[PDB]
Design a protein around this nucleic acid. Structure first.
Ligand SMILES: [Mg+2]
Ligand SMILES: [Mg+2]
Ligand SMILES: [Mg+2]
Ligand SMILES: [Mg+2]
Ligand SMILES: [Mg+2]
Ligand SMILES: [Mg+2]
Ligand SMILES: [Mg+2]
Ligand SMILES: [Mg+2]
Ligand SMILES: [Mg+2]
Ligand SMILES: [Mg+2]
Ligand SMILES: [Mg+2]
Ligand SMILES: [Mg+2]
Ligand SMILES: [Mg+2]
Ligand SMILES: [Mg+2]
Ligand SMILES: [Mg+2]
Ligand SMILES: [Mg+2]
Ligand SMILES: [Mg+2]
Ligand SMILES: [Mg+2]
Ligand SMILES: [Mg+2]
Ligand SMILES: [Mg+2]
Ligand SMILES: [Mg+2]
Ligand SMILES: [Mg+2]
Ligand SMILES: [Mg+2]
Ligand SMILES: [Mg+2]
Ligand SMILES: [Mg+2]
Ligand SMILES: [Mg+2]
Ligand SMILES: [Mg+2]
Ligand SMILES: [Mg+2]
Ligand SMILES: [Mg+2]
Ligand SMILES: [Mg+2]
Lengths: 138, 83, 99, 124, 71, 208
RNA sequence: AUGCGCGCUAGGUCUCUGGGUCUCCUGGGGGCCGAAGCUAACGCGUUAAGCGCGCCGCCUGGGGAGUACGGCCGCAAGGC
RNA sequence: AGCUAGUUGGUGGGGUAAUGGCCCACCAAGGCGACGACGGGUAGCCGGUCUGAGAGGAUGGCCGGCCACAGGGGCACUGAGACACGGGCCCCACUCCUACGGGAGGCAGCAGUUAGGAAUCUUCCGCAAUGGGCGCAAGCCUGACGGAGCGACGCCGCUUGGAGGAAGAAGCCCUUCGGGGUGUAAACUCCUGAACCCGGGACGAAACCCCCGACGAGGGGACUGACGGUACCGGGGUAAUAGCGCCGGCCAACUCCGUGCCAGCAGCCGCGGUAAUACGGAGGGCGCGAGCGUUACCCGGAUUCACUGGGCGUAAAGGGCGUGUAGGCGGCCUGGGGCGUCCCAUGUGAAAGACCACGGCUCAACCGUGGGGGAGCGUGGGAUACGCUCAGGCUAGACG
């Protein structure tokens, strides 16, 4: 079983970040798409789009990188340091308004799936509605 | 039997009283239905005595039979006074 | 408010009576993981119109007997013995694991 | 492990067990001597240390180390335990505590003497 | 204070036991557990069964001694 | 009670000049100038490089010595500060200062802190009406401190007054030098004090 | 001395076995050496011990001791 | 690991203020259970309390609520209400009296004795306050309570002086014999004036009572203190208890003799077998301070049972593998439902405590007033992104 999609996507993204692969692939979903959009808005990727690979709706990820470094380790400074699907299917997390974390004391973001759509932490706070804590990203 | 009465709450030599509504058969500190006012013997403050008038009146209406000190306090506070 | 429950009739082997399985789904007091929990209830029905494998709405009541403390309100769907089936299987399994 | 598994089985909590059956977790316990002896220490260190086997109000018969510099204690004298392991000596979990009862204090301690039932050197 | 009640009596070694513990039969009378001096151990002076060592003795318990001097 | 006993010895130990004698601790006689080392047999021994913890402890001791308070009291004060909002250093220091005895000293109602405390104890002083004898008193801001009329007479007090007819008071306080009065104007800030102490170290020491 | 399942993440090299438009592609196994990464190091490294997720099985100092006691199996040995 | 025979359901009846296997007669043959029954142990439970960054973990002392029990057991009766602590009957156990037939007891009420025990208080005053009961009321009771007494038992507060006063008294210790320390510490001078005595001295207590007013509202009056001659205020008025632990590392603080693997210390590492910074003393020092240590018990540190936050090739640890039930978990699209989930509103979350403010007791403790919050749970409305669920579909998984 492809036992979670979101988690898988996140993993793929992480892998891409690790190996400096500019571009990666992931199957398509509404939820996934929304997440990608959010990421784009934040600035955590360059962009997304849905090309057909094979014959099945896949998804291009356009992978962001920091300026190519000088010194030992001239491998690019990362944009996404760490990305973690927090509400793993099983350990299912639901945060109300008082329980959303200011992740990294504000710098990076959590992503909250909510009644009022799929969105950032700040947005959630503003709208006062909490929900499923899909993923933490910094 | 329901009484408006006094509940001691301060300390040794320092008495302080809750004008309070409860059942007769309870400890003097006991679980009461409604706090309504407070009183101090030392008259130590500008406001040593206070009561919520309306609440007290309501209690009386139902048939809260106040103990005599409590009654006096109520009178002083202006709950028996009718205009 | 009288307690309104919704579960499945998993046994009628009694006069007027139905046994009702309620999946109560709730999060754990620490680990969060939502757990499916079962409580077999006894319910009163001066009809026996409600039969085995029927999903029913259950009302909290004044008691009729030692642990028979519910009235049947109304049917939701009939014949879903498939959900009963699991319960029966579990019961059967009970036999296996003793000595 | 994994979360459902945890829920099923549980984190089998550790009961932190006592280093002392002075019973009841009674902090100090009085006892009567059975034998008073001298004792060879362990393998790193050597001497001949002071231990009484002591029967309790709790019922048992345990080993109790007498500190000081030379006990007044004997064979049927009444004594107090305060517990506490002594590292060198095997099975001894119990300090006899100098001061109370027939465990009289150490003569001519002058420094650490409250641990030893020794009242003040009266000054002039 | 150092209680100097330490009983400085001689004994011929009956037996050998581990850790240099020795049942030594005394000039005084008994044979009691008496273990080696540290000094002796340091100096590698091998106590062997049939030797007149000086078994120091505690008045609290004579039944245990301490070997002081080289045979 | 207090510390009570050899005082400039403490100074020697902590290795910084503190003023506890007042005058005298102003001469070449806080020992410090005449002698500039730790007490006892090994005070004139060559110094060791100490521990971080040790340093912190020393700092704490110094602070405690300055206000000459029981350590339990100090602890309690610290706890209170922690409980309260804001800079748990500066605010703590302010709170400490708001101790009646210290306030008395700092207004220059007394030459020495211990002396001030003694005076307070013996009913010589009065805050805002009542004769207070309790040095611990947390003087709330905007409050008037005077010598008691019954103890207005004594020469010592006069001398003290004369001594501060010559110096400036701490900017969180004012004083009527003539009619033996004074104000605790606002809450004392830490920067208004120039204290031998580094507050952070103190906080660290407490923080376990 | 590596639970099973699925997904992803540089290669090269030999090897077996299949299909191809058959000097080289593409699958499925068996090895070796190694990117990133991981790891206490050794090492591991598209056959992961990496990144994840699903689920289960265990672990919480050694010795005591796989012993005792109980329980079940076994004709016993003994096992769990 | 199976349990259950009034045990599970039913008709009728009894019983109860009332439902009910509470009980009975009879029929039915269930009911519970690994989502942990039954059995064994443990245990009053909670508000809380301690801890803890938090999540938790431990605990349930006093104060508040409820429960249960009054030597053990059983039962009813009276009654609004008990299965009835200072009511009854019965048995058992025990103590007491006996003219041996039999009766009387119940401190897990205060207080105290005794026993056990490491350990825990006065055979106290008083009905003045508060409450309780009775009574028209006066009043009468009230070991509820108010207080005092004992215990550094805990917390908080203060006193054992302050100022001056040697390039530095002696005493004691070290010494490199120059000196250094104790140490401005002292002595001494100045001032204060804890203690202690004299003078006054209470708030707490205005009601209930009387009378005017209708015995109402309202008005006037008077009686009424255990604490206590205490708190306190005025005057006078003496320099007037310091102790304990430590001093190798953790860990703050070092030297000398004594001792020489001995005596000893220890919480761990360990120190000691001849100048021990670790043992015994001395000085010196450090920590606290009317306390300080020790021991127990608990949390922490211990992310060492790990949800936040561990692991499993070799360290403890992958089951010998397969198949497979329960259970857990589930690809993509489209919609409906809205259980989970989220939000708002509101109800509830008692007081005390915790929290913030201010106030009072000379501060603080302590206590008061005000406010907020508070997880959870109900109810009404909604949201539908996700999980669930019902419907339709799809082929990347899976199977063929
Ligand atoms: Mg001798
Ligand atoms: Mg398997
Ligand atoms: Mg590398
Ligand atoms: Mg390799
Ligand atoms: Mg590993
Ligand atoms: Mg075997
Ligand atoms: Mg066996
Ligand atoms: Mg009936
Ligand atoms: Mg039992
Ligand atoms: Mg019990
Ligand atoms: Mg209670
Ligand atoms: Mg009884
Ligand atoms: Mg009894
Ligand atoms: Mg009746
Ligand atoms: Mg009664
Ligand atoms: Mg006794
Ligand atoms: Mg009397
Ligand atoms: Mg009469
Ligand atoms: Mg009487
Ligand atoms: Mg009392
Ligand atoms: Mg104190
Ligand atoms: Mg010692
Ligand atoms: Mg030590
Ligand atoms: Mg020493
Ligand atoms: Mg974990
Ligand atoms: Mg680990
Ligand atoms: Mg192994
Ligand atoms: Mg299944
Ligand atoms: Mg799904
Ligand atoms: Mg509250």
């Amino acid at each position: 079983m492809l036992t979670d999609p979101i988690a898988d996507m996140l993993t793929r993204i992480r892998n891409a970040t690790r190996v400096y692969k500019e571009s990666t692939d992931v199957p398509a979903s509404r939820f996934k798409e929304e997440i990608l959009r959010i990421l784009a808005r934040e600035g955590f990727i360059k962009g997304y789009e849905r090309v057909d690979v094979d014959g099945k709706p896949y998804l291009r990820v356009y992978l962001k990188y920091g300026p190519r470094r000088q010194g030992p380790d001239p491998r690019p400074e990362q944009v996404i340091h760490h990305i973690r699907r927090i509400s793993k299917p099983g350990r299912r997390v639901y945060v109300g308004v008082k329980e959303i974390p200011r992740v990294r004391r504000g710098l990076g973001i959590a992503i909250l799936s909510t009644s009022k759509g799929v969105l950032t932490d700040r947005e959630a706070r503003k709208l006062g509605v909490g929900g499923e804590l899909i993923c933490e990203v910094w | 039997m329901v009484k408006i009465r006094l509940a001691r709450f301060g300390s040794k030599h320092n008495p302080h009283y809750r004008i309070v509504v409860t059942d007769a058969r309870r400890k003097r500190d006991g679980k009461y239905i409604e706090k309504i006012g407070y009183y101090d013997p030392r008259k130590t403050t500008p406001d040593w005595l206070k009561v919520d008038v309306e609440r007290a009146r309501y209690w009386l209406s139902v048939g809260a039979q106040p103990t005599d000190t409590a009654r006096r306090l109520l009178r002083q506070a202006g709950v028996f006074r009718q205009e | 408010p009288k307690k309104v429950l919704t579960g499945v009739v998993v046994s009628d082997k009694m006069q007027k009576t139905v046994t009702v399985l309620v999946e109560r789904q709730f999060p754990h007091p620490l680990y969060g993981k939502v757990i499916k929990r079962s409580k077999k209830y006894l319910a009163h029905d001066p009809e026996e119109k409600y039969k085995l494998g029927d999903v029913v709405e259950i009302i909290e009541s004044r008691p009729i007997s030692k642990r028979k403390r519910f009235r049947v309100l109304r049917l939701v769907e009939s014949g879903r013995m498939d959900l009963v089936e699991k319960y029966l299987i579990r019961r059967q399994n009970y036999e296996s694991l003793s000595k | 492990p994994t979360i459902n598994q945890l829920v099923r089985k549980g984190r089998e909590k550790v009961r932190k067990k006592s280093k002392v059956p002075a019973l009841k977790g009674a902090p100090f316990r009085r006892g009567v001597c059975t034998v008073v002896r001298t004792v060879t220490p362990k393998k790193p260190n050597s001497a001949l240390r002071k231990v009484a086997k002591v029967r309790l109000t709790s019922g048992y018969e345990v080993t109790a180390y007498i500190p000081g510099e030379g006990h007044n204690l004997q064979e049927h004298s009444v004594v107090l335990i305060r517990g506490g392991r002594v590292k060198d000596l095997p099975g001894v979990r119990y300090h006899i505590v100098r001061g109370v009862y027939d465990a009289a204090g150490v003569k001519d301690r002058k420094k650490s003497r409250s641990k030893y039932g020794t009242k003040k050197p009266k000054e002039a | 204070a150092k209680e100097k009640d330490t009983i400085r009596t001689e004994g011929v070694v009956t037996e050998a036991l581990p850790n240099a513990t020795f049942r030594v039969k005394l000039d005084s009378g008994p044979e009691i557990l008496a273990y080696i001096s540290g000094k002796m151990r340091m100096h590698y002076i091998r106590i062997l069964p049939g030797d007149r060592v000086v078994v120091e003795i505690t008045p609290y318990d004579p039944t245990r001694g301490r070997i002081v001097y080289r045979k | 009670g207090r510390y009570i006993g050899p005082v400039c010895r403490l100074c020697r130990r902590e290795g910084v000049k503190l003023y506890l004698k007042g005058e005298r601790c102003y001469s070449p006689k806080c020992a410090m100038e005449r002698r500039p080392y730790p007490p006892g047999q090994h005070g004139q021994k060559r110094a060791r490089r100490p521990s971080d913890y040790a340093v912190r402890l020393r700092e704490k001791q110094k602070l405690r010595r300055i206000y000459g308070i029981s350590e339990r009291q100090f602890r309690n004060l610290f706890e209170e500060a922690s409980k309260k909002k804001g800079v748990t250093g500066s605010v703590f220091l302010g709170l400490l200062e708001s101790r009646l005895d210290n306030v008395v000293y700092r207004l220059g109602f007394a030459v020495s802190r211990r002396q001030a405390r003694q005076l307070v104890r013996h009913g010589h002083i009065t805050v805002n009406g009542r004769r207070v004898d309790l040095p611990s008193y947390r003087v709330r801001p905007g409050d008037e401190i005077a010598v008691a009329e019954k103890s207005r007479n004594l020469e010592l007090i006069r001398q003290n007054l004369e001594a501060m007819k010559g110096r400036k008071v701490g900017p969180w306080l004012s004083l009527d030098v003539e009619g033996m009065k004074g104000k605790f104007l606002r809450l004392p800030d830490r920067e208004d004090l120039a204290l031998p102490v580094n507050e952070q170290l103190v906080i660290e020491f407490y923080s376990r």
